[PDB]
């Protein structure tokens, strides 16, 4: 009966690890199903999930719920209304976001895979080799596939703190990373963006047993990023090596501002960096995005008139839905997690 899918959320909305994110994801399903013209709302709230504006959208959702309380029920609005005021997020336990983002990257890749001319990356080489020649890349005359484009683009770690330092200093934000200097180690795991190794994955979303790092959040750095931006899934820092993409790119912007397609070609790169870095576990959308979105690093784009779409796809639906499903189950099986941690306590 359907009233077991409704109770299920009445019961999934009562877990002690529910946060701001999971609410938006479960509610929509709840609205999408309690109802069955309201197409825009699941896109308006969606756009906001990719931007981490869970704050306003929770409320708009709970404004639609009341306005359309007619086609919904007293119970859904009651419950939904009780849970919202009491909401916070923890990077460590914000894991639905992580699935979304892990799945989003693979989505931004086909896109880039559908973006044919990969010559854009090849030309970028001539700019790296002039930034750190001592560490010059000397590879395929042509980067033909994104896997080739990706590995090299991930090779900017060769550009040391030395050629990037002029840039890292002026940021006010970078001095505020909160990655502790305690080398906690490596832990083996089943999915990369969802670094949590004990996360309930779907067997479909399972990758090989790769060894992921454990990173700690130094809560005491005054101004920790995690403190200022808690929605961002796991962040102990801000993307340092992004400062390096910029060197290779500052030299490129100025050499190919002459070309008229640079607007496209710069987003092809920035988007790829954003995707591969989220898939491979190195960072989070926002860790990378907040750096390039800096007063000093945006000037370069302004001078040559480039408008960046920092990897923002407006068809993020499949990813949304897939996550709505995550929480659904995660929440039920972790609420009985204590039904049998209470029935058992009735044997002793």
């Amino acid at each position: 009966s359907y009233q077991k899918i409704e109770l299920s959320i009445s019961l999934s909305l009562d877990s002690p690890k529910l946060d701001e994110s999971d609410f938006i994801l479960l509610s929509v399903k709840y609205l999408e199903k309690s109802l069955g013209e309201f197409s825009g709302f699941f896109e308006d709230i969606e756009k906001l999930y990719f931007k981490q504006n869970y704050k306003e959208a929770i409320e708009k959702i709970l404004d639609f719920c009341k306005k359309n309380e007619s086609l919904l029920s007293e119970q859904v609005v009651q419950r939904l209304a009780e849970v919202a005021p009491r909401l916070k997020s923890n990077p460590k336990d914000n894991e639905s976001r992580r699935l979304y983002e892990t799945l989003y990257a693979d989505h931004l890749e086909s896109v880039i895979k559908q973006e044919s001319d990969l010559s854009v990356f090849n030309e970028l080489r001539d700019s790296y080799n002039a930034v750190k020649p001592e560490y010059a890349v000397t590879h395929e005359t042509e980067i033909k596939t994104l896997d080739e484009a990706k590995q090299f683009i991930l090779s900017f770690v060769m550009l040391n703190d030395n050629v990037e330092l002029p840039l890292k200093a002026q940021s006010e934000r970078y001095p505020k990373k909160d990655r502790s200097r305690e080398e906690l180690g490596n832990t083996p795991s089943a999915n990369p963006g969802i670094m949590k190794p004990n996360s309930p994955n779907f067997t479909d979303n399972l990758v090989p047993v790769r060894d992921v790092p454990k990173i700690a959040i130094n809560e005491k750095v005054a101004g920790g990023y995690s403190k200022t931006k808690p929605t961002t899934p796991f962040v102990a820092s801000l993307s340092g090596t992004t400062y390096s993409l910029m060197v290779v790119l500052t030299d490129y912007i100025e050499k190919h501002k002459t070309d008229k397609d640079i607007e496209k070609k710069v987003n092809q790169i920035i988007n790829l960096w954003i995707s591969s870095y989220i898939k491979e576990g190195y960072h989070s959308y926002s860790e990378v995005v907040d750096v390039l979105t800096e007063p000093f690093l945006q000037s370069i784009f302004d001078k040559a008139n480039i408008k960046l779409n920092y990897g923002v796809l407006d068809d993020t639906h499949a990813e949304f839905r897939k996550a709505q499903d995550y929480v659904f189950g995660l929440t039920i099986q972790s609420a009985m997690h204590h039904e049998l941690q209470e029935r058992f306590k009735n044997k002793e």
Binding site: L7, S8, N198, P200, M336
Partner: protein, 322 residues
């Protein structure tokens, strides 16, 4: 209307256990031979014959159309050996399903949802770590050594003490002895020096020592003692305390008296000198998987963790189930 019952089936390598939900008793336990076994080292290999175990299960032993069905699966089952479980029941058997990990079911029986469980059956002995009631892929470890093999061992050992149990009926005699008389010894070596169906034998502590050391058999694998530790150290340092303090013996081949005290010792010495080691053995370990499932099928909330026939309208097995 009545609350129609759900059904719980642990399709096993050697024996199948069906019964009815809630019941403290599985109704039926029956050899799976169709003579050809479908399930292999824990993973179904011939599906067609297993469709048959199912007909027997649903119909001849238990006497599907109006009863929901919860087949049990294994850790790290090839997942396409999952969708198919979904497909046969919904389609061939038009069931009004949820597939679960046997291990998860055992811990659940324990009354807890986090620990590491050792499950020795006949096909495979698995050490699975479960946290938050979730099977952990990066740590599941297995051994293709288990009870069926141990029976064979008792054969050879007696084969040379002079008794001979060659025939098929005779093979059952051997199984009968392993099942009871033979035991796990706390100090093997002392006990193979106190050395120096009931036709008596001193190969009582050696048969289950094969679980601890598979060398007798000629297998290059570590004792269940270590498949456990090993698996543990592939778990976050943080959760280890618990896993150590929540280790449950289960499966039928763990019915050998005394595996407990030993599991404690061997692991204890291998363990951090400071952690907390606790082994929990239920006397009902023979059938602990099932009982585990009954509880659940009777849990009010699990009722929505199932799969609707319209929800079926086979890749929902990954996304609505675990």
């Amino acid at each position: 209307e009545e609350e129609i019952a759900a059904l719980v089936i642990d399709n096993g390598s050697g024996m199948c256990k069906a019964g009815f939900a809630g019941d403290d008793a599985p109704r039926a336990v029956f050899p799976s031979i169709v003579l050809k076994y479908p399930i292999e080292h824990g993973i179904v290999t011939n599906w067609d014959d297993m469709e048959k175990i199912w007909h027997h299960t649903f119909y001849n032993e238990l006497r599907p159309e109006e009863h929901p069905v919860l087949l049990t699966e294994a850790p790290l089952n090839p997942k396409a050996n999952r969708e198919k479980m979904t497909q046969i029941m919904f389609e061939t058997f038009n069931t009004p399903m949820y597939v679960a990990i046997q291990a998860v079911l055992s811990l659940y029986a324990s009354g807890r949802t986090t620990g590491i469980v050792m499950d020795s059956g006949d096909g495979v002995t698995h050490t699975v770590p479960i946290y938050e009631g979730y099977a952990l892929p990066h740590a599941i470890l297995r051994l293709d050594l288990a009870g069926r093999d141990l029976t064979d061992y008792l054969m050879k050992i007696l084969t040379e003490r002079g008794y001979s149990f060659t025939t098929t009926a005779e093979r059952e005699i051997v199984r009968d002895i392993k099942e009871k008389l033979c035991y796990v010894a706390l100090d093997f070596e002392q006990e193979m020096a106190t050395a120096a169906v009931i036709t008596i034998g001193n190969e009582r502590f050696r048969c289950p020592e094969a679980l601890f050391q598979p060398s007798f058999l000629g297998m290059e694998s570590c004792g269940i003692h270590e498949t456990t530790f090993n698996s543990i150290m592939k778990c976050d340092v943080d959760i280890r305390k618990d896993l150590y303090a929540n280790t449950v013996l289960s499966g039928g081949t763990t019915m050998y008296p005394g595996i407990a005290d030993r599991m404690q010792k061997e692991i204890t010495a291998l363990a951090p000198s400071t952690m907390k080691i606790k082994i929990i053995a239920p006397p009902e370990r023979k059938y602990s998987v099932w009982i585990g499932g009954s509880i659940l099928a009777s849990l009010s909330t699990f009722q929505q963790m199932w799969i609707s026939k319209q929800e079926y309208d086979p890749s929902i097995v990954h996304r609505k189930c675990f």
